[PDB]
Write a protein that binds this ligand. Structure first.
Ligand code: CLA
Ligand code: CLA
Ligand code: CLA
Ligand code: CLA
Ligand code: CLA
Ligand code: CLA
Ligand code: CLA
Ligand SMILES: CC1=C(C#C/C(C)=C/C=C/C(C)=C/C=C/C=C(C)/C=C/C=C(\C)C#CC2=C(C)C[C@@H](O)CC2(C)C)C(C)(C)C[C@H](O)C1
Ligand SMILES: CC1=C(C#C/C(C)=C/C=C/C(C)=C/C=C/C=C(C)/C=C/C=C(\C)C#CC2=C(C)C[C@@H](O)CC2(C)C)C(C)(C)C[C@H](O)C1
Ligand SMILES: CC1=C(C#C/C(C)=C/C=C/C(C)=C/C=C/C=C(C)/C=C/C=C(\C)C#CC2=C(C)C[C@@H](O)CC2(C)C)C(C)(C)C[C@H](O)C1
Ligand SMILES: CCCCCCCCCCCCO[C@@H]1O[C@H](CO)[C@@H](O[C@H]2O[C@H](CO)[C@@H](O)[C@H](O)[C@H]2O)[C@H](O)[C@H]1O
Lengths: 175, 175, 160, 60, 161
């Protein structure tokens, strides 16, 4: 249906993309490329799924070669600077090779690339078409959920200073 | 025909959409008197110099070359701390680079594109879309670096520090 | 076909080619010389040099030459003869760039005529590959000396 | 040239050399200087008219 | 300070200039009774002299050995109020007068009798021009680049050689 029934449905939001509930009140996709916006939405979503898994795991696990922070966000400040720089350039190399060296909005989609697609299915979960369509919508909604959830986990961990699960087991309101 | 940058003024006759950073912006009509292609070569060269110069005003805040490790992070003092043999070598190297521009302008002025000094070692701009994006991006980052360096220079005159140090210490106004 | 950074667009290919062959030959001499210096010592040199290794020998002979020592002017003499050779063979590298008959690196120096006898379709590539290794090997040798006082044979023999 | 046309004077010894005058009449006889040109500035003598040859006068 | 000069607030010869200037006025005031107009006038002069010396002392002027304030005009910003800033004010007014007079001369050329407009000035049109001069740098530079300030060399009368 229409997500915001009093507002008119945005003209560029056809139902073809998965996760389309007609929710564009501010007015994007009337200015920017929906192909670029969808690539940004899936990229943000997958990064935040990995981020929420990383936050939960680092609250428990720690590699022996690394120290342990007070919180998984404090884990950033005890890993050596050169390590962070190596991770940054490794992610940059992946970003370069995956997009074929076209990263700008102007050239990223000059090769007829499909938004969110990098030809990544080693386990072949997208072999079936209808199952693939369902997994597309599942992906976009789990990505959206992990985006909000990552925001929540990071800010509560900064505020309380006591993790996620230890925070829940020792909940202490603002005083 | 009307200017795009300034919608109530007429279009400047000697600038055109073909030029990468075109906005229709020539209120005082320099191109009505001077050669448009000379102005473009000058704008591109000023932009490249200011791109390096903005990076150079910021970078020794982070790290210095070991030789100049004792030198100051205020750039306007580090200018005088360098020996004249060093500045002579800098001037000679820039002179060697400027021989190619002295040969481009004044001899084959009409052969080529503005700023085309035959320096494309990594073979970018082969893709036409990438070439367009990079041309416009070079012009806009050059203009932004001109404004940025002009700022940073006069700020270093007022607060006797570098940009980052000034920001961190919140020395934002004349003491 | 190895040129990922496109540095042959930034200079003349002929100048680069002759410069590469010269770097390869000089480094061939440097790498072979350092290994030979450890294996064999020309007579009398142990009093002027002691037991200094590759780069140390340059500084120590020039230190002795910095006094008025007659028996320490090796560096000046090698510098003189290589400079003389580079001065008189200097027009060759400008003739090649001007379109001249001589190819990069050929000074027609074949006394034994081993290259002339058999067709020289491989000896060229032999020299180029061996010299490319010679440059990298010299690099290795010098910086490893700059960390540990071992020479070629000493550093290769053990594993610190 | 023609009468009522605007002309640039090319006689180097004219007071009005490289200025604009207006053609008054053009003689048809064997006259050496048949074009009569009037100016708005007066010369040092206070004259504002002079005769010129076609070669000396160029249209603007 | 600059060029071996002394700030006027601590130079002792500036102080002697002020003291001698006030004694010169006080000995003239010693010949008049209190409420008279010459006494009031001389007291006003003494106050004016003291005010001028006090203001000069606190202004950052640099006195010489003579004790008279000196002006530094090499371009340094600590002394820009002595030549650079008065100079910017002058060039704005002078360029205004030049731009306004040029605009009236070009208007007067398109008149019925151009020489009657210059000895009998059209005051409403000339006041219209005098008001326009406040943006003379932009108007004159746009005039230049549009090919309307400078005339070409072949519409200018020259001598035979
Ligand atoms: C090409 C493969 C390769 C190699 C040889 C290395 C080598 C190294 N890594 Mg690893 N790393 C790699 C890929 C690689 N990295 C990738 C692809 C990732 C991300 C997935 C990481 C993530 C990573 C982390 C998270 C950490 C390292 C660290 C280190 C260095 C430790 C030395 C030390 O403690 O004192 C050296 C101390 C210094 C102050 C000198 C600075 C280190 C030099 C510059 C490392 C240079 C590596 C080089 C640039 C290759 C990286 C390319 C890039 C695309 C990743 C060692 C040289 C650790 C580290 O550096 O801690 C200090 C560390 O914590 N690495
Ligand atoms: C809930 C998790 C989830 C789901 C359902 C999907 C679903 C999908 N992804 Mg995404 N992806 C995710 C997490 C997820 N992804 C994360 C966290 C990463 C980063 C490690 C990626 C990285 C990634 C790439 C690089 C690509 C996909 C692609 C795909 C599609 C191929 C079908 C497939 O193998 O599904 C995966 C099924 C599971 C993960 C469930 C087990 C499908 C739309 C490909 C595509 O065509 O995208 C449109 C593609 O190129 N994804
Ligand atoms: C869903 C998103 C969301 C989130 C993440 C937060 C987060 C927060 N809110 Mg906000 N809030 C929200 C929605 C949200 N609020 C909405 C929609 C309203 C209505 C305008 C408010 C009104 C509100 C007030 C008035 C106050 C907060 C406060 C707080 C802080 C509570 C911290 C703590 O220790 O509490 C731990 C507390 C709990 C776990 C108990 C929560 C149960 C509450 C008491 C029940 C309220 C039921 C209510 C009648 C529902 C009607 C809905 C309707 C009127 C909109 C935290 C920053 C407080 C704050 O800033 O204190 C410093 C505060 O006083 N919030
Ligand atoms: C870049 C090359 C280079 C440099 C700077 C040096 C410099 C030095 N060497 Mg080392 N050396 C070299 C190459 C080099 N050598 C080579 C190639 C060898 C033979 C494998 C040696 C063998 C060697 C020994 C055994 C000793 C030195 C020693 C010394 C020092 C005194 C000079 C001397 O007696 O040399 C002697 C060097 C030689 C006799 C080698 C000359 C080989 C020539 C160049 C071959 C030319 C062949 C070809 C026909 C010429 C083509 C000409 C064409 C270009 C026109 C000095 C620091 C001495 C020292 O103080 O050590 C502690 C010492 O004992 N060197
Ligand atoms: C071609 C290479 C070569 C050869 C054949 C020799 C041969 C010799 N040297 Mg050595 N020497 C060499 C290069 C060479 N040198 C170099 C490159 C240097 C430094 C520039 C020296 C510096 C040196 C010293 C300081 C002395 C000798 C001396 C001698 C002679 C006596 C042997 C001795 O004292 O033990 C011996 C014939 C000694 C000599 O002449 O004593 C009479 C002596 O005192 N040598
Ligand atoms: C005879 C040649 C000469 C010339 C042309 C100048 C010109 C200038 N000097 Mg001076 N100067 C001179 C000789 C000269 N100086 C000598 C011999 C000395 C003694 C060593 C000085 C000492 C001196 C000092 C100490 C300073 C100047 C400064 C300046 C500049 C300020 C003017 C301005 O508003 O620009 C700059 C402003 C704009 C372009 C825009 C402003 C709105 C100007 C370029 C000042 C400066 O900023 O240096 C560059 C400054 O602080 N000058
Ligand atoms: C407003 C009219 C006007 C304008 C724009 C100029 C412009 C110029 N004059 Mg000319 N000039 C003028 C009036 C004007 N002049 C008058 C009235 C006289 C007679 C006194 C002269 C006598 C004169 C001489 C002798 C010289 C110039 C020179 C110059 C040039 C350099 C600036 C200068 O030296 O100023 C100098 C200005 C003066 C000497 C006199 C100016 C007198 C007043 C201040 C200006 C006229 C005001 C006018 C009445 C405006 C009324 C406006 C109203 C109707 C709206 C420049 C081309 C010089 C030159 O050729 O350099 C290349 C030069 O040597 N001028
Ligand atoms: C694509 C590809 C594959 C792949 C893959 C991968 C790596 C898939 C990874 C999937 C992952 C990691 C999904 C994670 C989702 C997390 C979500 C939705 C958030 C949950 C938390 C919430 C809502 C919360 C909360 C909370 C907040 C904020 C604050 C707290 O105080 C309280 C609370 C805890 C309640 C493979 C390799 C399989 C093959 C395949 O062929 C191709
Ligand atoms: C050419 C070419 C390639 C290349 C290359 C290279 C070397 C490219 C280099 C590119 C560079 C160095 C670009 C830098 C731009 C800097 C900017 C826009 C900064 C502006 C500063 C601002 C706006 C500011 C500010 C500030 C103000 C004033 C107040 C301050 O208190 C604070 C604040 C900081 C806010 C390669 C080699 C790959 C090959 C290829 O075949 C061809
Ligand atoms: C031209 C010609 C003539 C001639 C001639 C001449 C002078 C010919 C000379 C040829 C030469 C001198 C060849 C030497 C090459 C050296 C190499 C390849 C070394 C690489 C070292 C490496 C990889 C290393 C290393 C490592 C070790 C062991 C040590 C460690 O501490 C360091 C490290 C771990 C890095 C003749 C007269 C024949 C006539 C003919 O008609 C024309
Ligand atoms: C984000 C800004 C984007 C463009 C900014 C560029 C500014 C252009 C030039 C303007 C010069 C800045 O203006 C300069 O800074 C501040 C502004 O009140 C003034 O500084 C004064 O007020 C500030 C503000 O409380 C006091 O902290 C300070 O002690 C006092 O000197 C200077 O007297 C003025 O010279």
């Amino acid at each position: 249906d229409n997500a915001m029934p009093f507002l008119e449905r945005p003209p560029k939001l056809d139902g073809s993309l998965a996760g389309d509930v007609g929710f564009d009140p501010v007015g994007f996709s009337n200015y920017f490329d929906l192909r670029w916006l969808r690539e940004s939405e899936l990229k943000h979503g997958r990064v935040c799924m990995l981020g929420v898994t990383g936050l939960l795991v680092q609250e428990a696990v720690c590699l022996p070669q690394f120290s342990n922070g007070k919180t998984p966000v404090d884990d950033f400040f005890v890993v050596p600077a050169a390590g962070l720089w190596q991770v940054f350039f490794a992610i940059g190399a992946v970003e370069f090779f995956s997009h074929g060296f076209k990263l700008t909005p102007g050239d990223m989609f000059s090769e007829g690339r499909e938004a969110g697609d990098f030809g990544f299915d080693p386990l072949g979960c997208g072999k079936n078409p209808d199952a693939l369509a369902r997994r597309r919508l599942v992906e976009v909604k789990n990505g959206r959920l992990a985006m909000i959830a990552f925001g929540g986990l990071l800010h509560q961990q900064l505020l309380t200073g006591q993790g996620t699960f230890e925070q829940l087991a020792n909940f202490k309101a603002i005083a | 025909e009307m200017s795009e940058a300034i919608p109530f003024m007429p279009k400047p006759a000697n600038i055109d959409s073909s030029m990468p950073g075109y906005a229709g912006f020539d209120p005082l009509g320099f191109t009505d008197y001077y050669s448009a292609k000379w102005m473009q070569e000058a704008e591109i060269k000023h932009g490249r110099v200011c791109m390096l110069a903005a990076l150079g005003m910021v970078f020794p805040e982070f790290a210095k070359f070991p030789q100049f490790a004792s030198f100051s992070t205020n750039p306007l003092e580090a200018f005088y701390q360098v020996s004249p043999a060093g500045w002579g070598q800098i001037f000679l190297f820039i002179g060697v680079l400027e021989t190619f521009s002295y040969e481009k302008s004044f001899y084959n002025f009409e052969g080529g594109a503005p700023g085309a000094l035959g320096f494309d070692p990594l073979r970018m701009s082969s893709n036409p879309a990438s070439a367009k994006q990079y041309a416009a991006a070079e012009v806009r980052n050059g203009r932004l670096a001109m404004i940025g360096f002009s700022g940073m220079l006069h700020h270093a005159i007022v607060s006797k520090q570098g940009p980052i140090t000034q920001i961190v210490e919140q020395n934002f106004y004349p003491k | 076909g190895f040129d990922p950074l496109g540095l042959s667009t930034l200079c003349n290919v002929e100048w680069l080619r002759e410069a590469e062959i010269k770097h390869c030959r000089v480094a061939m001499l440097a790498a072979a010389g350092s290994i030979a210096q450890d294996l064999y010592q020309f007579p009398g040199v142990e009093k002027i040099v002691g037991s200094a290794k590759m780069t140390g020998v340059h500084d120590k002979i020039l230190a002795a030459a910095s006094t008025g020592d007659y028996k320490a002017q090796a560096m000046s003499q090698i510098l003189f003869w290589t400079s003389f050779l580079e001065i008189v063979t200097l027009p060759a590298v400008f003739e090649t760039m001007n379109g001249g008959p001589r190819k990069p690196g050929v000074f027609f120096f074949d006394p034994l005529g081993l290259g002339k006898g058999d067709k020289m379709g491989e000896m060229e590539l032999k020299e180029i590959k061996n010299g490319r290794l010679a440059m990298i090997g010299v690099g290795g040798m010098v910086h490893h000396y700059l960390l540990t006082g071992k020479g070629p044979i000493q550093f290769l023999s053990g594993i610190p | 040239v023609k009468r009522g046309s605007k002309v640039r004077i090319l006689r180097k010894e004219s007071y009005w050399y490289q200025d604009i005058g207006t053609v008054a009449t053009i003689d048809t006889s064997g006259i050496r200087y048949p074009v009569v040109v009037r100016f708005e500035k007066v010369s040092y003598s206070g004259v504002n008219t002079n005769n010129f040859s076609l070669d000396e006068v160029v249209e603007v | 300070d600059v060029a071996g000069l002394t700030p006027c607030g601590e130079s002792k010869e500036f102080a002697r200039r002020l003291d001698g200037s006030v004694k010169k006025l006080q000995t003239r005031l010693s010949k008049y009774e209190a409420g008279t107009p010459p006494a009031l006038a001389l007291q006003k002069q003494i106050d004016k002299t003291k005010n001028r010396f006090d203001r000069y002392g606190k202004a950052g002027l640099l006195c010489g050995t003579d004790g008279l304030p000196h002006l530094i005009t090499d371009g340094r910003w600590t002394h820009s109020g002595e030549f650079v800033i008065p100079g910017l004010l002058f060039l704005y007014v002078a360029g205004w007068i030049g731009w306004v007079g040029r605009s009236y001369v070009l208007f007067a050329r398109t008149a019925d009798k151009p020489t009657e407009k210059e000895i009998i000035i059209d005051v409403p049109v000339a006041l219209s021009f005098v008001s326009t001069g406040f943006i003379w740098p932009f108007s004159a530079f746009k005039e230049f680049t549009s090919g309307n300030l400078i005339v070409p060399a072949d519409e200018i009368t020259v001598s035979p050689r």
